[PDB]
Write a protein that binds this ligand. Structure first.
Ligand SMILES: CC1(C)S[C@@H]2[C@H](NC(=O)CCCC[C@H](NC(=O)C[NH3+])C(=O)[O-])C(=O)N2[C@H]1C(=O)[O-]
Length: 345
């Protein structure tokens, strides 16, 4: 690969701050040589600086953790990707036709209940931040709406899919998702900054605070750091660090977390758009210089995450901005992948 471009990474972070991120940071693990940059503040009220060791909420990056657990269950003979969801969770869905593979790739047609919750950004956050939901509560909220398409038909993102994934993990293992993440992923990879504490609202240890951008332009930011994330759970509640998400996606792509057969299934791409695909709890992004990278993005209130690795896991990058509901910031932070993988123009 080309050399990572630290001047370009520095410019991306400075642009994100100019667009409303209180703080922004990035860590690259380039085959054993570390790159680490940060600019701005973890806490905008106290002024404490952000750093690449600050813990944060990874949002839908959590789905890659859920998918790894489910694909290990396929390796163990406990789960068949082409069986019906209802085979394992009787009576759950009105269509006994929807399969596990379809949920894991966002091809199920299940309505995304969070489009009801967050029609208004700050009111919807204030509504859910201190609520505790069961998995079944969230499925019932989805099923108030009919499906949006035929099973298998189209990519349509829905958090409901990885609520189903959490329910499958707990049903088939007899354990909580926190126990399965710890035993199958966090402990074997020594992810000392990585946690699943739901429904606790505290982020353990030194962390970046999250700042939710209101829908009104120029409105005051809302501290969204402490919430249950119970509206997402196995779709979005993991806490981690840049070093630990680099370790995780490098281990995944280098073949340490499942059989070769299941990794191959995880990388069967469904088209998202002309430069992106979706596998099984895994995203592919095609970069300008002809390189593809693999991993996941996350959005949870106050935190935007990108965490991607090269095909062989030898270069990994994790970037974090501690704001959300700011599409300019989101789009700017994607440029860290260009600078880290494609290097200087
Ligand atoms: C598909 C995504 C982008 S959204 C999905 C999941 N996060 C959510 O579903 C939260 C949606 C509300 C986010 C909120 N926005 C609003 O409230 C809008 N009114 C904000 O910006 O904080 C996550 O994480 N995924 C990202 C993913 O996979 O990258």
């Amino acid at each position: 690969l080309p050399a990572p471009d630290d001047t370009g990474l520095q410019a991306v972070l400075h642009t994100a701050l100019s667009q409303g991120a209180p703080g922004a940071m990035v860590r690259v693990d380039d085959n054993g040589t570390i790159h680490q940059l940060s600019e701005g503040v973890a806490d905008r009220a106290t002024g404490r600086a952000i750093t690449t060791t600050d813990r944060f909420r990874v949002g839908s990056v959590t789905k890659s953790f859920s998918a790894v657990v489910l694909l290990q269950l396929v390796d163990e003979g406990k789960l068949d990707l082409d069986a019906s969801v209802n085979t394992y969770l009787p009576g759950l869905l009105p269509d006994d036709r929807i399969t596990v593979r379809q949920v894991m790739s966002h091809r199920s047609g299940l309505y995304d209940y969070t489009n009801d919750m967050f029609a208004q950004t700050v009111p919807g956050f204030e509504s859910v931040r201190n609520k505790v939901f069961s998995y079944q509560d969230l499925i019932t909220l989805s099923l108030k709406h009919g499906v949006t398409n035929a099973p298998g038909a189209a990519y349509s993102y829905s958090n409901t899919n990885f609520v189903v994934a959490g329910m499958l993990i707990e049903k088939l293992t007899g354990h909580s998702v926190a126990t399965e993440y710890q035993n199958r992923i966090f402990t074997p990879l020594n992810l000392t900054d990585t946690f699943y504490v739901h429904p606790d609202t505290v982020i353990p240890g030194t962390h970046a605070n999250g700042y939710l951008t209101p829908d009104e332009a120029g409105g005051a930011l809302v501290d969204s750091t402490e919430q249950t994330v119970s509206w997402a759970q196995s779709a979005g509640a993991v806490i981690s660090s840049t070093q630990d998400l680099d370790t995780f996606f490098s281990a995944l792509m280098s073949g340490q977390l499942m059989s070769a057969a299941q990794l191959a299934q995880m990388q069967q791409w469904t088209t998202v758009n002309s430069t992106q695909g979706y596998g099984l709890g895994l995203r592919r992004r095609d970069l300008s210089c002809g390189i593809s990278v693999y991993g996941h993005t996350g959005t949870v209130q106050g935190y935007y995450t990108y965490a991607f690795a090269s095909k062989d896991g030898k270069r990994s990058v994790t970037a974090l901005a501690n704001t959300s509901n700011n599409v300019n910031v989101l789009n700017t932070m994607a440029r860290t992948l260009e600078s880290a993988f494609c290097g200087k123009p």
